Design a protein around this ligand. Structure first.
Ligand SMILES: [Ca+2]
Ligand SMILES: [Ca+2]
Ligand SMILES: [Ca+2]
Ligand SMILES: [Ca+2]
Ligand SMILES: [Ca+2]
Ligand SMILES: [Ca+2]
Ligand SMILES: [Ca+2]
Ligand SMILES: [Cl-]
Ligand SMILES: [Cl-]
Ligand SMILES: [Zn+2]
Length: 462
């Protein structure tokens, strides 16, 4: 049916970066999260051995202070500096947050599963200012789990201020845990490019084990590097070691006002870029994106991507995660809930809110806001939505999606029985307006949105 542009914007955003299911994207086969995860783990190796899946591990790590040799043949060893140590520990933590891994530092002569060191020259003893980093897969051989970084790169020496350095630590540790590049390519071997990718979603938007920029898949991080595991990385590492169900099991806030004590989930002011895929194992959680003025699009569905703070495709939610609440900023935003009971706050600006299934509580904020309903299942009597700050003559409630079963008619105080009728009923004692919809094919009146405030018939879009 002809539906409104507000509904169409929800319908489209729900399908942003659709994947898998026999789609073709960028002329390549599109993989699901799980297909991408299987591809990233295709070497079938982990610290637990070969072809061992879903098994936790307790691992050691060490910052080498000297070496007998570097397993690649590079030379000019330099130990990690203090900033590299701090950032590497943050990278390790970002992996142990999502998978069932513990990391324990060892020093002195103790062997370690994962090691860190820098190099500066090739096997011929000439300075190497061109390469970046590499690491070795788990195994029982000499050098297994070791990771190596070019100290002549400023991003490697300064990973706390040069985002690519922190990303590189996360990437290399991923190899040291058993993850592979999503395609058969490597640095030094020819000149690969995204054109050589096996599947469309081989980019930083989905995996920081990729070589390819997030622009290759239509995302845009405005020159930033995220630094922590992205959505397919989380699925991949959980395939090997199991998911960590102890992480952030309380009510967690991501974005502004964050309580995660993780830099990559925290924006401290509006100039801060956020790039993350969230893992969260319990509790009632909030995406607080309130500090931005850009028009944002925020989706709470697991697996989905959001456009946050002026970037594109920079936030996603890992498979297995339920995030319950979202707060937009002063821009004109779209906030899309999931089947849970969501509290959505549009903030200032003219926002479109869609609770989806479940009993949602919606605040448009200042501005001309639109609360969208796509199905009778979005607001059943048994689990109805509240719209708590509705402004008569300014906000709108959009029922245009119901046109697909016949144009809805407005009735004043009684239903005829014909169905596809909408009624507003004012409760003067409580100052509540109940919006009732008797839907085609329903014998009883089964859709209700309760509104804290008055509403006019002309505020209801049918
Ligand atoms: Ca939580
Ligand atoms: Ca939750
Ligand atoms: Ca807003
Ligand atoms: Ca919902
Ligand atoms: Ca608003
Ligand atoms: Ca409003
Ligand atoms: Ca709902
Ligand atoms: Cl030169
Ligand atoms: Cl839903
Ligand atoms: Zn790599």
């Amino acid at each position: 049916a002809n539906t409104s542009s507000a509904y169409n914007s929800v319908y489209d955003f729900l399908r942003y970066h659709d994947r898998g299911d026999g789609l073709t994207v960028n002329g390549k086969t599109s993989y699901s999260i799980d297909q991408a995860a299987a591809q990233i783990t295709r070497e079938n190796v982990s610290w637990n051995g070969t072809n061992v899946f879903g098994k936790s591990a307790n691992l050691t790590f060490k910052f080498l202070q000297s070496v007998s040799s570097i397993p690649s043949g590079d030379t000019g060893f330099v130990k990690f500096n203090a900033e590299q140590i701090e950032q590497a520990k943050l990278s390790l933590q970002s992996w142990s947050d999502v998978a069932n891994l513990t990391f324990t530092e060892v020093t002195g002569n103790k062997s370690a599963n994962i090691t860190f060191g820098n190099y500066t020259r090739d096997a011929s003893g000439n300075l190497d200012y061109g390469t970046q980093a590499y690491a070795y897969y788990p195994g029982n051989y000499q050098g297994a789990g070791s990771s190596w970084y070019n100290y002549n790169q400023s991003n490697i020496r300064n990973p706390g201020s040069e985002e690519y350095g922190r990303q590189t630590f996360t990437h290399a540790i991923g190899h040291a845990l058993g993850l592979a590049h999503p395609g058969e390519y490597n640095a030094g071997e020819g000149d690969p490019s995204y054109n050589d990718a096996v599947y469309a979603e081989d980019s930083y938007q989905f995996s920081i084990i990729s070589y390819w920029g997030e622009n290759e898949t239509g995302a845009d991080y405005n020159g930033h590097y995220g630094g922590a595991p992205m959505i397919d990385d989380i699925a991949a590492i959980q395939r090997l070691y199991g998911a960590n169900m102890t992480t952030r099991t309380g009510d967690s806030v991501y974005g502004f006002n964050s309580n995660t004590d993780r830099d990559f989930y925290t924006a401290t002011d509006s100039s801060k870029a956020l790039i993350f895929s969230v893992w969260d194992a319990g509790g009632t959680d909030t995406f607080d994106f309130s500090g931005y003025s850009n028009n944002q699009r925020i989706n709470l569905n697991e697996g989905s991507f959001s456009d946050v703070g002026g970037l594109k495709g920079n936030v996603s939610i890992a498979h297995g995660v339920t995030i319950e609440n979202a707060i937009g900023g002063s821009g004109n935003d779209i906030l899309v809930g999931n089947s849970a009971d969501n509290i959505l706050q549009g903030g200032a600006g003219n926002d479109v809110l869609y609770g989806g299934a479940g009993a949602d509580t919606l605040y448009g904020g200042a501005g001309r806001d639109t609360f969208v309903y796509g199905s009778g299942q979005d607001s059943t009597v048994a689990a109805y939505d509240w719209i708590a700050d509705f402004q008569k003559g300014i906000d709108k409630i959009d029922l245009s999606a119901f046109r697909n079963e016949g144009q809805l008619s407005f009735v004043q105080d009684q239903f005829t029985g014909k169905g596809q009728e909408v009624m507003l009923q004012w409760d003067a004692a409580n100052s509540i307006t109940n919006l009732w919809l008797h839907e085609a094919g329903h014998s009883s009146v089964d859709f209700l949105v309760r509104i804290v405030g008055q509403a006019a018939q002309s505020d209801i879009i049918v």
